[PDB]
Design brief:
Layout: E1 25-29, E2 33-34, H1 43-55, E3 63-69, E4 75-78, H2 83-91, E5 96-103, H3 106-113
Parallel strand pairs: 2-4, 3-5
Antiparallel strand pairs: 1-5, 3-4
Catalytic activity: S-hydroxy-S-oxy-L-cysteinyl-[peroxiredoxin] + [protein]-dithiol + ATP = S-hydroxy-L-cysteinyl-[peroxiredoxin] + [protein]-disulfide + ADP + phosphate
Subcellular location: Cytoplasm
Binding site for ATP: 82-85
């Protein structure tokens, strides 16, 4: 019952030109979010965010997210922040979360994970 859609097919892929670069807000599924950085959550700040999304979902600005592809088009989304907003969105069991996508290169990731950087495929 997951919201399948991406990957219009599975075989015609072959050097597909992206629709030009477009860095804007996008609802990225919670099921494909990568979080390799833990952070102690606070119950007072999470309730405030949970109250903001419930009181007004358009009153909560998006978060920054790095968007990088692997050696095989495998798209990988990394989120270094909004950790609390994730707990608030997670509780609402919502299907996706607002997040600004930022196309980057593996080198940029090294600046952040210049130690536990895995091999993207």
């Amino acid at each position: 019952g997951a919201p399948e859609g991406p990957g219009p097919s599975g075989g015609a892929q072959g050097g597909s030109i992206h629709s030009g670069r477009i860095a804007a807000v996008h609802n990225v599924p919670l099921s494909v979010l990568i979080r390799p950085l833990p952070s102690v959550l606070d119950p007072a700040k999470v309730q405030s965010l949970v109250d903001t999304i419930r009181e007004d979902p358009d009153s909560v600005p998006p978060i920054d997210v790095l968007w990088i592809k692997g050696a095989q088009g495998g798209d990988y989304f990394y989120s270094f922040g909004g950790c609390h907003r994730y707990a608030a969105y997670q509780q609402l069991q919502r299907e996706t979360i607002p997040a600004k996508l930022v196309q980057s290169t593996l080198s940029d990731l090294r600046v952040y994970l210049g130690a536990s950087t895995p091999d993207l495929q």
